[PDB]
């Protein structure tokens, strides 16, 4: 019993056939039911004909006889049609405003999350409806994930390789770590405690976290959790102050933080401030700066994954005093150089999914791109931070949407903070790219960076591009470009110093074949962030929007800090790329 989403007037009708069953304002509820397929409503008691052996769930046919709700052929002579006056009977009917236009909510609730237009509707709408849309999409994808078949292993071939069967009548999820499985060990009583695994083609290859011995009969599932109703907004109201609020300015400065402090007063000058963080510009070092720029500030290190907070933890063991740090991990192996489960600490390092409800002097949100509107507002629910920092970039990798099928969702429409970053602009900017040379920074700057990123040291002339055609062959969850696999070895033979470079791949199963041919390590484009290598190579494989659209390639090209190899099979970015083109062997 709460207030309805659109009207915020108190009500007690809950949309039954709707996904998350939102609180429905009475006449507003009538609008929702008449304009959608959601014909079921539940009050403190449900609105279903209580006469035994009935089926009807649509509210309109339900009439009120005495203390119960009745369809037409079930009533006593005395009735009171609930579906009357265009206003379904419900609590607080007169303290009701309704909504003139509900069709936006109607399409949000009737949404299967198929096209990019669904995310456009979710992002373009206001606070409450965007939160509802985020919760519905999360619950709906979580529902489909368990709708796929079970990953049973019936034979044990060798180490890191298994023979797996699948449930009949339900499909098979993809062959990458994009959806990590979670099997439990089946005994005579029940199934318990195997762990989280990733399966890829090998015969299959399982990539477990810890050491394990998997026998026959052990089957793995895509475990689901219960998405809970979010409360706080994604962004707290903006307010520009007149002085440094709540913090005492630093006495002495560090030259490595000279470019940091210049942008730091405006961080504490206002409630929340946005960032323009290019890859390898010291954003983690930027986040560390606030601790040295304010020793008494209680800052909290947050990101989408523990491996991303690990980057903040990576720069914490050096500059941050270990006596004041705490890493929070729920009861997966990661950094634990700090003390665990310590809420009452100065430096707090945790993932957005596990930090308890506290208050923060100033928050640092690492990697805001992959954190959607769900976890955008999750942090504000846990902490009413006195200051807010958004470390990340809309021009950086978002979370992979398993439900988005047609249309490519715009970089600005990832969430609220990334949306304003393309309209009012970012409040900060770090103008030095601490890894990439002139050959990479200059090219990526002219792509989506508004030519705002400038070269650091030199043009190493070690980044090369190639023109080619190729013929693609695809499988269940991959696609391998054979001519590029022929080319990659052909290119590396005539210079033995090129064998120290790692191979990057959009579809990691393509490199799995390449790893058999050459043996160079593997990289996933979607998760290549945080990790960088001096020598690294790439094959474009496909020119589709999945792989080589302008922004999802920007992470892979920026992996190298001296020189990179990538054979453009496309021509959309090959013309724009300011690399060196050589002869095709």
Binder of Zn ion out of 13, 14, 23, 25 (CB under 5 A): 25
> Do 348 and 300 meet the contact criterion of CB atoms below 8 Å apart?
yes
Distance CA 213, CA 21 (A): 43
463 marked as binding residue: no
What is the smallest separation between the CB atom of 45 and other proteins, expressed in angstroms?
7
188 binds other proteins (CB under 8 A): no
282 annotated among ligand-binding-site residues: yes
Enter the tokens of residue 3. Answer: 């207030």
| The entry of Zn ion, other proteins, its own copies, none that residue 64 binds, CB within 5 to 8 Å by partner kind | other proteins
At 506, give phi and psi (nearest 5°). Answer: -70, -50
Min. distance of Cβ 92 from its own copies in angstroms?
Answer: 6
HEC readout, 130-177: HHHHHHHHHHHHHHHHHHCCCEEEEEEEECCEEEEEECCCCCCCCCCC
| Closest alpha carbon to 397 in 246, 558, 286 | 558
Q: Does residue 139 contact residue 128 with C-beta atoms inside 8 Å? A: no
Which 32-51 residues touch Zn ion, going by CB under 5 A? Answer: 38, 49, 51
Contact 126, 115 (CB under 8 A): no
Identify the residue among 12, 14, 18, 292 touching Zn ion (CB under 5 A).
18
Give which of its own copies, Zn ion, other proteins, none residue 12 binds (C-beta under 5 to 8 Å, depending on kind). Answer: other proteins
Q: With binding defined as CB under 8 A, does residue 54 bind other proteins?
A: no
Q: How far is the CB of 76 from other proteins (least distance, A)?
A: 8
Question: Which does residue 502 bind out of other proteins, its own copies, Zn ion, none, counting CB within 5 to 8 angstroms by kind?
Answer: none
Min dist. Cβ of residue 32 to Zn ion (A): 6
Spatial distance between the Cα atoms of 90 and 44, rounded to a whole number of angstroms: 10
459: how many CB neighbours lie within 10 A of its CB? Answer: 14
Out of its own copies, other proteins, Zn ion, none, what residue 10 binds, judged by CB under 5 to 8 A for its kind, is: its own copies
Cβ at position 108, least distance to Zn ion in Å: 9
List contacts with its own copies (CB under 8 A).
10, 53, 55, 73, 91-92, 94-95, 168, 245
Instruction: Give the one entry of Zn ion, other proteins, its own copies, none that residue 7 binds, where binding means its C-beta sits below a cut-off of 5 to 8 angstroms depending on kind.
Output: Zn ion
CB-CB contact of 13 with 24 (8 Å): yes
What b/e sequence results for 351-378 when a residue is b if at least 16 CB atoms lie within 10 Å of its CB, and e otherwise?
bbeebeeeebbbbbbbbbbbbbbbbbbb
Q: Is 325 assigned to a binding site?
A: no
| Separation between Cα atoms, residue 303 and residue 375, nearest integer Å | 10
| C-beta of residue 128 within 8 angstroms of C-beta of residue 5 | yes
Distance between CA atoms of residues 216 and 392, nearest Å:
44
Burial bucket for residue 68 (CB in 10 Å: 0-12, 13-18, 19+): middle
Residue appearing with tokens 């509820």? 29
**Is 243 or 469 the residue whose CB approaches its own copies more closely?**
243
Question: Of 8, 37, 45, 95, which lies in the binding site for other proteins, with binding defined by CB under 8 A?
Answer: 45
**Number of residues assigned to the chain:** 585
List for the chain the helix, strand, coil content (%; round to 5). Answer: 25, 20, 50
Q: With H, G, I as helix, E, B as strand and everything else as coil, classify residue 428.
A: coil
CA distance 207 to 204: 10
Q: Which of other proteins, its own copies, Zn ion, none does residue 49 bind (CB under 5 to 8 Å by kind)?
A: Zn ion
Closer Cβ to Zn ion, 15 or 362, answer by number: 15
**CB of 91 vs other proteins, minimal distance in Å:** 6
CB of 395 to Zn ion, least distance (A): 35
Q: Of 91, 116, 334, 448, which lies in the binding site for other proteins, with binding defined by CB under 8 A?
A: 91
Q: Residue 28: which of its own copies, other proteins, Zn ion, none does it interact with, CB under 5 to 8 A by kind?
A: Zn ion
Q: Convert residues 25-44 into a mask of x (bound to other proteins by CB under 8 A) and - (unbound).
A: ------------------xx
Tell me if 277 is assigned to a ligand binding site: yes
Residue 449 dihedral angles phi and psi, to the nearest 5°: -95, 5
8 A C-beta contact, residue 457 and residue 466: no
Pick one of its own copies, other proteins, Zn ion, none as the site partner of residue 94 (Cβ within 5 to 8 A by kind). its own copies
| Binding flag, residue 424, other proteins (CB under 8 A) | no
Cα of first residue to Cα of last residue in the chain, in angstroms, is 71
15 is in an annotated binding site: yes
- 503 neighbors 572 (Cβ within 8 angstroms): no
- Least distance from its own copies to the Cβ atom of residue 212, Å: 23
Q: Which does 126 bind (CB under 5 to 8 A by kind): its own copies, other proteins, Zn ion, none?
A: none
Contact (CB, 8 A) for 173 and 222? yes
Nearer to other proteins, 43 or 443 (CB): 43
4 is in an annotated binding site: yes
Pattern of binders to other proteins over 7-26, x per CB under 8 A?
Answer: -----x--------------
Interface with Zn ion in residues 91-130 (CB under 5 A): 109
Q: Is 262 in the site for other proteins (CB under 8 A)?
A: no
Q: How many CB atoms are closer than 10 A to CB 342?
A: 13
Q: Is 300 exposed, middle or buried (0-12, 13-18, 19+ CB in 10 A)?
A: buried
Backbone angles phi, psi at 468, to 5 degrees: -165, 165
- Which of the choices Zn ion, its own copies, other proteins, none does residue 95 contact, using the CB cut-off of 5 to 8 A by kind? its own copies
CB-closest chain residue to Zn ion: 25
Closer residue to other proteins in complex, CB, 92/166: 92
> Is 71 an interacting residue with respect to Zn ion (CB under 5 A)?
yes
Please give the DSSP secondary-structure letter assigned to residue 377: H
User: Which two structure tokens, joined as six digits, stand for 290?
Assistant: 């606030």
For residue 80, the partner it binds in Zn ion, other proteins, its own copies, none, with Cβ less than 5 to 8 A by kind, is other proteins
Query: Annotated binding site for Zn(2+): which residue ranges?
Result: 4, 7, 15, 18, 25, 28, 32, 38, 49, 54, 71, 74
* Binding site per annotation, positions: 4, 7, 15, 18, 25, 28, 32, 38, 49, 54, 71, 74, 277-284
Q: Which residues bind other proteins (CB under 8 A)?
A: 1, 12, 43-45, 52-53, 64, 67, 77-78, 80, 89, 91, 93, 331
């Amino acid at each position: 019993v709460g207030a309805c989403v659109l009207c915020n007037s108190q009500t007690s009708l809950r949309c039954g056939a709707c996904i998350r069953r939102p609180f429905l304002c009475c006449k507003c509820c009538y609008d929702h039911v008449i304009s959608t397929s959601h014909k079921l409503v539940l009050s403190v008691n449900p609105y279903v004909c209580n006469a035994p052996g009935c089926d009807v769930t649509d509210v309109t046919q339900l009439y009120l006889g005495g203390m119960s709700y009745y369809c037409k052929s079930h009533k006593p002579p005395i009735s009171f049609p609930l579906c009357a006056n265009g206003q379904v009977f419900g609590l607080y009917k007169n303290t009701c405003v309704g909504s003139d236009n509900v069709t936006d909510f109607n399409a949000i609730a009737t949404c299967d999350w198929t096209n990019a237009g669904d995310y456009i509707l979710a992002n373009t709408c206001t606070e409450r409806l965007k939160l509802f849309a985020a919760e519905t999409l999360k619950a709906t994808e979580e529902t489909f994930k368990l709708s796929y078949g079970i990953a049973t292993v019936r034979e044990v071939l060798s180490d890191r390789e298994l023979h797996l069967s699948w449930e009949v009548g339900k499909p098979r999820p993809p062959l990458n770590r994009n959806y990590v499985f979670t099997g439990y060990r089946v005994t005579k009583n029940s199934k318990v405690q195997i762990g989280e695994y990733t399966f890829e083609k090998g015969a299959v290859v399982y990539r477990g976290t810890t050491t394990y011995k998997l026998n026959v009969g052990d089957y793995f599932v895509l475990t689901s959790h219960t998405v809970m109703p979010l409360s706080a907004p994604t962004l707290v109201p903006q307010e520009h102050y007149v002085r440094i609020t709540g913090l005492y300015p630093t006495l002495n400065i560090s030259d490595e933080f000279s470019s940091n402090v210049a942008n730091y007063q405006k961080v504490g000058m206002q409630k929340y401030s946005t960032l323009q963080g290019p890859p390898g510009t010291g954003k983690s070092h930027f986040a560390i700066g606030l601790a040295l720029y304010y020793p008494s500030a209680r800052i909290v290190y947050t990101a989408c994954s523990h491996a991303a907070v690990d980057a903040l933890c990576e720069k914490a063991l050096k500059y941050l005093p270990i006596d004041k740090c705490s890493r929070i991990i729920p009861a997966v192996e990661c950094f634990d150089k700090f003390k665990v489960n310590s809420t009452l600490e100065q430096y707090v390092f945790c993932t957005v999914n596990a930090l308890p409800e506290t208050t923060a002097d100033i928050v640092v949100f690492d990697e805001i791109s992959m954190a959607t509107n769900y976890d955008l507002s999750v942090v504000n629910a846990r902490l009413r931070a006195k200051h807010y920092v958004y470390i990340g970039d809309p021009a950086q990798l978002p979370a992979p949407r398993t439900l988005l099928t047609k249309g490519t969702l715009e970089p600005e429409y990832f969430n609220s903070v990334c949306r304003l970053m393309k309209t009012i602009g970012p409040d900060m900017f770090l103008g030095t790219c601490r890894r990439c040379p002139a050959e990479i920074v200059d090219t990526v700057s002219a792509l989506v960076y508004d030519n705002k990123l400038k070269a650091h040291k030199d043009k190493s002339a070690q980044c090369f591009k190639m023109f080619y055609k190729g013929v693609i062959t695809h499988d269940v969850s991959s696609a391998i470009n054979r001519p590029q696999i022929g080319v990659v070895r052909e290119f590396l033979t005539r210079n033995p110093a090129w064998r120290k470079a790692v191979f990057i791949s959009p579809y990691n199963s393509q490199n799995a074949v390449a790893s058999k041919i050459l043996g160079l390590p593997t990289q996933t484009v979607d998760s290549s962030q945080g990790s960088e290598y001096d020598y690294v190579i790439f094959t474009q494989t496909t020119e589709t929007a999945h792989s080589c659209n302008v922004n999802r390639f920007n992470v892979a090209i920026t992996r190298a800090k001296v020189g990179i190899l990538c054979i453009m099979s496309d021509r959309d970015l090959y013309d724009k790329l300011q690399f060196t083109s050589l002869e095709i062997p």
